[PDB]
Design a protein around this ligand. Structure first.
Ligand SMILES: Nc1ncnc2c1ncn2[C@@H]1O[C@H](COP(=O)(O)OP(=O)(O)OP(=O)(O)O)[C@@H](O)[C@H]1O
Ligand SMILES: Nc1ncnc2c1ncn2[C@@H]1O[C@H](COP(=O)(O)OP(=O)(O)OP(=O)(O)O)[C@@H](O)[C@H]1O
Ligand SMILES: Nc1ncnc2c1ncn2[C@@H]1O[C@H](COP(=O)(O)OP(=O)(O)OP(=O)(O)O)[C@@H](O)[C@H]1O
Ligand SMILES: Nc1ncnc2c1ncn2[C@@H]1O[C@H](COP(=O)(O)OP(=O)(O)OP(=O)(O)O)[C@@H](O)[C@H]1O
Ligand SMILES: Nc1ncnc2c1ncn2[C@@H]1O[C@H](COP(=O)(O)OP(=O)(O)OP(=O)(O)O)[C@@H](O)[C@H]1O
Ligand SMILES: Nc1ncnc2c1ncn2[C@@H]1O[C@H](COP(=O)(O)OP(=O)(O)OP(=O)(O)O)[C@@H](O)[C@H]1O
Ligand SMILES: Nc1ncnc2c1ncn2[C@@H]1O[C@H](COP(=O)(O)OP(=O)(O)OP(=O)(O)O)[C@@H](O)[C@H]1O
Ligand SMILES: Nc1ncnc2c1ncn2[C@@H]1O[C@H](COP(=O)(O)OP(=O)(O)OP(=O)(O)O)[C@@H](O)[C@H]1O
Ligand SMILES: [Mg+2]
Ligand SMILES: [Mg+2]
Ligand SMILES: [Mg+2]
Ligand SMILES: [Mg+2]
Lengths: 217, 217, 217, 217, 217, 217, 217, 217
C-alpha cells in the first residue's frame, strides 16, 4: 500500500481523506484546527493537530516518509504556498495542491507543485452544462470535440428501439448503455428498447449529440 | 429566451456564470461585494451589486423573469438559507444551491431547494480515485457497480492490439476509444493498435477494470 | 411528572425554566455560557454547560429522554435552527421554539417545530392596547370579536351599583368580578357596589365594552 | 390628538408601534439604525433616524408634543437608562420602559420611569403554565388565588352538558363561555352542550380549576 | 481606626488609596484588573481582584463591614452605577463616587450616592485661574466673593515692607504669611519684609486682591 | 491680547477651556473627535477639529499666535508626547501638560514641558484628607509643615467665642474667618461667636490643628 | 530618460524614493495608503495612491514605461509576492524586492525577482561589528577574507607617523587615507602624521587588521 | 569578553544578536513574544521571554550588569521609548536604539540614548546609488566628497592594464584591488590586467569616479 498525507481537512481534503481511507490506504490527516482533527479522527489512520508551516512540526509528523502529500489549504494562500515550499525542500515525490485563483496557481507552478486542482471551477463548468441542457445528467469529455454523455430519456423516446433510433449513421454516435429502474444494460443489442426516465449513455461528437437531442428527443 | 441568475460569485458560482455566458445564454451575475461584481462584469450579460437576503433588492433585479436561480453562497449559511427561502416564496421554478455540510443540505431540502450540490466533496472523491490509481485520468459512474474509465496506457500496452488485449472475454470489458497524439478513434476495430501514453477508454465492472489494470497494464 | 429540557437561558427561557421548577417538574437547564448556568443553577434540577449544536454533546445530555424540549435561543438564528433540526432527527415528541422574525418562523415550521413563540411581539400588542386605553389593566381575547377585560374603575363609577350599570341589556356585556382593596368578589349580585380604583372584570363584544367605557366610565 | 413615540424598534418596540399605528393613532417611530427606520416606515405616521441619548436630536423630533414615550431599547442598558433620564428631565408625562434584568428595573424605578415592562419574563411564565398543562390555551389572573382560564375540551367532555358538568357545586367554578367551530356562546344556559376540541372558559380558584382538569376532563 | 474600601484603582482611586494607607487606615483596594491589584498591593492593607458588579464576589469581600466605600470606577459608567446600586442595597453608611459627566452625576444622585466627585473638572478650574494669572500659585475660596491666595512675589515687591504695602486699608485685604527660601513666616508683623520669588499669602475679596495685583505687583 | 489654546477636550481640558472662556479670554478649543468639538463650540472663542500630532494641521490653526498651549491628551500617551514635542519645536512659550503616570511625567520633563499636572492624583490626596477627617471641607498647604484649613464647626463649638476658644495660646493656631448662614467674617474680633454648622477657617501647624480637632471640636 | 517606480513607502522604500529624486531621476512613488502618498509627494516626480496587487491599477500608472520597479512592501508578504509576480508577467526588466525572511526570499527567487534585499539583516551584521569593536566606524568587505576598514584613531596612535606605524611589513596592511578635523588625505606619504580622534582607513586581511587594533592601537 | 543584551528580536535585532553570538560574545536575547525567543534560542547565550517595560521583569534579567543594551523594538514606539527611559534610569553605560521616524529619534536623543540607528533608511540610500549606477556593487564614503567604490567591470575595460587606465593623473583616483574569479589582488602593480565581470575597487573624489565611469567604462 501507498502512504498519503492530507494537510487541510476542508470539504475538499476531508472528502479526499475519507474516500482514500475507505479504500484502505494509510492516510495521515493534518489540520491546525483541533475540531477538524476530532471530526475526521474516525476516518483516517492517524489524525494530528499541526501547523504545517512550522518546519519543526512538519519533521515531527515524519512527512518526509510519504510518497503523496495533498495540500488542501484554501483560504490562507500564504499557508498553502509556504507549506508547498517546505514540502518541496523536503524532496517529497508527489505534492498535489488545491488552488484559489489564477495567480495562486502560478506561484504553485513556479515552486514545484506536481498537480494543481480547482475543485469548484471544474464543477461549475460541469453543472453549467446541466443547467443549459436539462437532459444531461453527467458526462465525460474525450477531447474538445468528442464526449460520452448520460442522458435522461423523455417521452419522445418512450418505447423506441435502438435501431429505430439510428445514431451511428444518422448522427455518427453510438448508444453504450441503458439504465432501467436501477437495472443496467451494457452494449445493448439493436433490438433493445428504451423507456422514459431511463438513463441513456451515448457517445459521439458533441454537436452531433446536441443534434440527436434537438431532433431525436 | 431562458434566463439564468447566479447569486454568489465564489469560485463555484463564478465558474457557472462565466461558463453559462460563454455558451451564449442570458445570465445575470449577483453579489453583495462590489469588487466581485466588477470582476465578472466582463463575463455576464448583466452584473448587479445586491444583497440577496433583502426581498426588495431581489424584486428590483427583476428576478421574476428568471427560470433558474443558482445560490452559490458558501461561508454564510444563513444568507444561503434565507436566499433559498425567499426565492421559493417568490415561486422561482428551479433553485439550485451549493451546500456546506450535511445539515445545510437537510434544511435546504426541507425548504424546497430543487437541486443541492457539493462541489468540493464530489471532486475530493474523484481526485482520491486518481491518487490511489495514477492510471485513471477521468471516469464516470453508470451505477454502483458499473463505470466508464479513461486510462493512461503504459509500456505494457505499447504497440499492442485490441484483439491482442482481449478484454471482452478476458476481463468482460470493452474498449470504447483510443486517443493518440490528439487524434481520436471511436469504437476501434479489432486490428487497431495502442501506443504508450495514449488514452484508452474502457467500460465494464469496476472490479474487472481494476483487474485489467493489475494484470493487463 | 413530565421531564422538560430548556436550551437557552435568556430572559425568556430563564423565566420558563424558573417557573417550571417552581411547579416541581424535572427540568434540565442548558446554555453554552457558563455564567448563565451558574445563574440558573439554583432554579433547575440539573444545569449543564453545553453547545446544543454539537450532536455528541446532545447525546451526552441524554436529550432523547425528554418529552419537551424548549429552544429559547434567540440572537443566533443558525444555532436555533440547527438545534431544532438535531432535536427533530432525534425524534423528540414536543419541540417548542422562540422565533426572531417571520422568516425564522418559516424555516422552523418547515423543519418540524411543534410550537413557535414570539414573546415580545405578543406582549407588544397587549401593551399597546393598554397605552391606547389607560382603563385596561389586562385582558384575554375569546375571539376576534369577543373579550374579557380587567378595567381600572374611575370616579365616574364611584358608588355605582351593578344594576345601576346595566350592561347586559344596555351594552350586551356582563360583569364577572370586582376587586376591592385586594379582597376579591366573584359573580357579584345585582346589589353589589363598585368604588373607584377597584379592578372591574367585564365580558362581552370588544366594541360594546369600548362603548361602555366611553359612555359609562 | 394624543401622540405616541416609540424609541427602539426591536421585536417589542416594533410590535407596539405597528400595533398603535393599526389602531389609527398618531405614532412616531424612532431608531438609531437606518435599516430599522426604513422597515417600520410603512407602519408609522412618521419614522425618524435618531440617537435618543442625544438631547438635541431629541428636541429636534418635537418630542415635547408627545404625551407617551415608550423606551424599547434593550441590549444597551446605558442607552435605555440615559434616554429615560433625558425624557424625565424633559417633563414627559408617561415614560414606559422595557427592562433587561432586576437591577435595570431598580435604576429605572429610581430615575422616575412610569411603567416598567419585562415582556420575555412575563411570557415565560405564561408559556410554562401551558407546558405543564397542555389543556390551558390562555388565562388571566384576577389575584394571587383567582384566575380565568380558557381550556381545550377533551373527549371526556365531548357531548356533555353544563348541568352534566356541574362545576359551580362540584368544583366551585363557573363556565363563562363555549367556543365551537368558531361560533361563540356567552354565559351559556344549563342545557348547553360541549363538544371535543371546543374552547371552554372557566372562572374560579386556581386549585379548584386544576382539580376539575384532573377529574372532570 | 475607620475602615475604607476603594473600588477602582485608577489615578484617582490609586491616589486616594495610597494616601489613606500612608495615614495608617485599614484600606481594602479592589480592582477587576490583576495588574492593578499587583501595582497597589504594596500600598494597602488588603488588595483583592474582584468584579464589584457581582453581588456574590461583593459579599465575599465582606464589604458590608465598611463605613466608607469609594467607587472610583470611571470609564465604565454601567459598572460605576451598578456597583453603587449594590452598595446602597447593602446599607453601606458612606458611599463616595467619581462621576464622568452631568448625567452620570444625576443617576448617582437618584440611587443614593452620598458624595459625588469630579476630580478633573475641579482641577481644570483651579489650573485655569493659574493660566490667566501667573502670579497665583494656589488658592482657596471662602465663598463666591472672598478668597485666600498664595502669590509668587515679583520684583515690584522686592524689599517692600508689609506696612509699605498697606492692604488692610488700601485694598481691604490682609497678608497671612511669607515663605522665604523654604523658611515660613506666619502672621508677620508690620515691620516684616518681602523679597522677590517668595510665596506671599493674602486674604480678602477676589476683586480687591486682583486690584492689589494690578496696582501693587 | 493673550491667546490660550487647549488641545484635548477631556474632562480636564474641557473644564480649563470652558473656564478660560468664562473669564473672557481668547480661547481656541482643539480635538480630533468632531463630537467633542461640537460640544465645546458654545464654550470657546473658536473650536477646531484637528489632529495635534500632525505638524501641518497644527500650523494651519495659527498656533504661532498662542502664548499658552495646554496639552490635555490622556489615554494616548504617544499623542500627548508627540504633541508636546511638536509644540516645543515650534517655540511655544508655555506648554502645560496633563500626565498619566510617573514615566510620562519623566519624558515630558526631558522634552521640555513647562508645567506638568496630575489632576486625579492631586484630588485623590485632597479627598483622602476629607475621608479620614470628615471635619475638613477644604485646605491649602503653605509648606510641608504648615496649612490653612476650613472646618465644619460641630456642636462642641456651638455658641462658643473666639476668646473662649483660645487657639493662639492653647494650640498655637489662629482663626482667620467665620462663615455663618452664608455671611462672611474676616479676622474676627475676640468677642465673635461660632455657631454649629458654620465654616471656621484656621491656620497653623498641621499637628496643632488636628489636636484642636480632637480636643477643641 | 530612465524611469524608476517605488511601490511601498516604508522606511526602506521611502528612503530609496527620496534618494532617487534627490539625484534628479524620474521617480514614481506608489502606496495604498493615502497619508503615505501625501507625505512623499514632495520627494517624488509623481506620487500615486494605488493598490499594487491590482493589475488594472498597475497598468493605469503607465508602469510599462519603467525600467526599474522596487517592491518595498514588507508586513504583507502576500502583497509583495503577488506584486512581484504581476510585474514579472508584465515583463518589467528589473524587479528589486525587499525580503522579510528566508522563505519569502525563496519564493521571490522562484518567481523571478531580479534582486532581493534584506536591509535590516545586513545592517544588523554591520552594527554588530561596531558593537564588538568600538574602533570600527564603517567598513566594506572585498571578499570572505579581505576588507577595507575605517578606524577611529586612539591616543596610542596620536602624533604617530605612517612609517612609525609600519603596517605593511608589521601587519601586512596598508593605510589608504587619513581624515583630520574634516580635511582629507589620500595615499599618505611615509612622513604623514596621525592625531587622536582622526579617521584612519586601513586595507588588509581581517585578522591582520584586528591584530593591529589589539597591538597597534 | 563584553556582555550584550538585545531587546527586540526583529530582523534587525535578530541579525545583531546572531552575529554577535557567532563572534563569541555573551549575549542575552530578550523578546516579549515566546515564538521569537524559541527562534533565536539556538543563537544566543541566554534567551528570555520578558516585557522590557516592566521594571520588575527588567531587574529579574539583571540588566544592570550589561555594558551594552540594544533596543531593537520598532513598531511600538511607546515600548521603545519607555524601555530606553528605564535603561537610562538604571545607569546602563551604552544604550543603542533602533529609530522609526524623525520624532522618535528626537525623544530618544532627549532621554539619553547613546547611539540611534536607522537601518532601512541607511540601506535605502546605499541601494539607490546602485539603482542609479548599475556599475556600483558596494561603496564606502570617506566624506561628502571622497569615496571608495567597488565596480563591476564591463567589456570596455576587458584586457585593459592599470597603466593603460591612468586614473591617478587622468582622474585623480587610484585602483586599490582587483577580484578575478574569486581570487583577490590587493594593491596591484602598474602591469596588472583587468578582465570583464571582475570586481574593481577604486578610490578618489566621487565626481572624478563618475567621470572615470562615463568616459573610462
Ligand atoms: N497552516 C496550516 N496548517 C494546517 N492546516 C491549516 C493551516 N491553515 C489552514 N489550515 C486548514 O485548512 C483547512 C481548509 O481551509 P479553508 O476551509 O480555509 O479553505 P476552503 O477553500 O474554504 O476549503 P474547502 O473548500 O475545502 O472547505 C481548514 O480546515 C484549516 O484548519
Ligand atoms: N447576502 C449575500 N448576498 C449576495 N452575495 C453574497 C451574500 N453573502 C455572501 N455573498 C457572496 O457569495 C460569494 C461566495 O461566498 P463564499 O466565498 O463565502 O463561499 P465559498 O464557500 O468560499 O465558495 P467558493 O468555494 O465557491 O469560493 C462571495 O463572493 C460573497 O461576496
Ligand atoms: N449553541 C448554543 N447552545 C446552547 N445555548 C446557546 C447556544 N447559542 C446561544 N445560546 C444561549 O441562548 C441564550 C439566549 O440567547 P440570546 O440572549 O442571544 O437571545 P435573546 O432573544 O436576547 O433572548 P431573551 O430575549 O430570552 O434574552 C443565551 O443565554 C446563550 O448562552
Ligand atoms: N441610543 C439609541 N438610540 C436609538 N435607538 C437605539 C439606541 N440604542 C439601541 N437602539 C435601537 O433599539 C432597538 C432595540 O434594541 P435591542 O434589539 O438591542 O433590544 P432587544 O433586547 O434585542 O429587544 P427585542 O427583544 O425587542 O428585540 C434596536 O433596533 C436598536 O437599533
Ligand atoms: N466592574 C469593576 N469592578 C472592579 N473594578 C473595576 C470595574 N470596572 C472597572 N474597574 C476598574 O476601575 C479602574 C479605573 O477606571 P478607569 O481607569 O477606566 O477610569 P478613569 O476615569 O480613566 O480613571 P482615572 O482617571 O482615575 O485613571 C480601573 O483600574 C479598572 O480596573
Ligand atoms: N492626536 C490627537 N489630537 C487631538 N485630540 C486628541 C488626540 N488624541 C486624543 N485626543 C482627544 O483628547 C481628549 C482627552 O483624551 P482622553 O479622554 O483619552 O484622556 P483622559 O485621561 O480620559 O482625560 P480626562 O480624565 O480629562 O477625560 C479626547 O477627547 C480625545 O478626543
Ligand atoms: N498592496 C499594496 N499596494 C501598495 N502599497 C502597499 C500594499 N501593501 C502595503 N503597502 C505599503 O507598503 C509600505 C511598507 O509596508 P510595511 O510598512 O508593512 O513594511 P515594513 O517591513 O514595516 O517596511 P519598513 O521597515 O521599510 O518600514 C506601507 O507604507 C504600506 O502602506
Ligand atoms: N515591550 C516589549 N518588550 C520586549 N520585546 C518587545 C516589546 N515590544 C515589542 N517587542 C519585540 O520587538 C521585536 C521587533 O519589533 P517589530 O518587529 O514590531 O519592529 P520592526 O521595525 O518591524 O522590526 P524589524 O524591522 O527589526 O523586523 C518583536 O519581535 C517584538 O516581540
Ligand atoms: Mg470551496
Ligand atoms: Mg428579547
Ligand atoms: Mg481622568
Ligand atoms: Mg524594518
Amino acid at each position: 500500500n501507498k502512504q498519503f498525507a492530507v494537510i487541510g481537512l476542508g470539504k475538499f481534503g476531508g472528502s479526499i481523506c475519507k474516500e482514500l481511507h475507505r479504500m484502505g490506504h494509510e492516510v495521515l490527516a493534518v489540520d491546525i484546527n483541533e475540531e477538524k482533527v476530532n471530526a475526521y479522527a474516525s476516518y483516517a489512520t492517524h489524525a494530528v493537530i499541526a501547523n504545517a508551516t512550522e518546519e519543526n512540526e512538519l519533521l515531527s509528523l515524519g512527512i518526509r516518509n510519504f510518497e503523496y502529500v495533498i495540500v488542501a489549504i484554501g483560504a490562507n494562500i500564504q499557508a498553502s504556498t509556504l507549506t508547498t515550499l517546505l514540502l518541496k525542500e523536503l524532496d517529497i515525490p508527489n505534492i498535489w495542491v488545491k488552488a484559489q485563483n489564477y495567480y495562486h496557481h502560478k506561484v504553485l507552478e513556479k515552486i514545484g507543485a506536481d498537480r494543481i486542482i480547482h475543485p469548484e471551477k471544474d464543477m461549475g463548468v460541469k453543472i453549467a452544462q446541466s443547467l443549459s441542457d436539462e437532459n444531461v445528467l453527467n458526462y465525460i469529455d474525450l477531447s474538445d470535440e468528442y464526449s460520452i454523455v448520460e442522458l435522461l430519456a423523455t417521452r419522445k423516446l418512450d418505447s423506441k428501439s435502438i435501431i429505430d433510433l439510428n445514431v451511428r449513421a444518422k448522427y455518427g454516435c453510438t448508444i453504450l448503455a441503458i439504465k432501467h429502474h436501477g437495472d443496467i444494460c451494457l452494449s445493448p443489442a439493436p433490438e433493445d428498447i428504451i423507456r422514459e426516465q431511463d438513463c441513456l449513455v451515448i457517445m459521439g461528437h458533441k454537436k452531433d449529440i446536441k443534434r440527436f437531442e434537438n431532433e431525436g428527443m
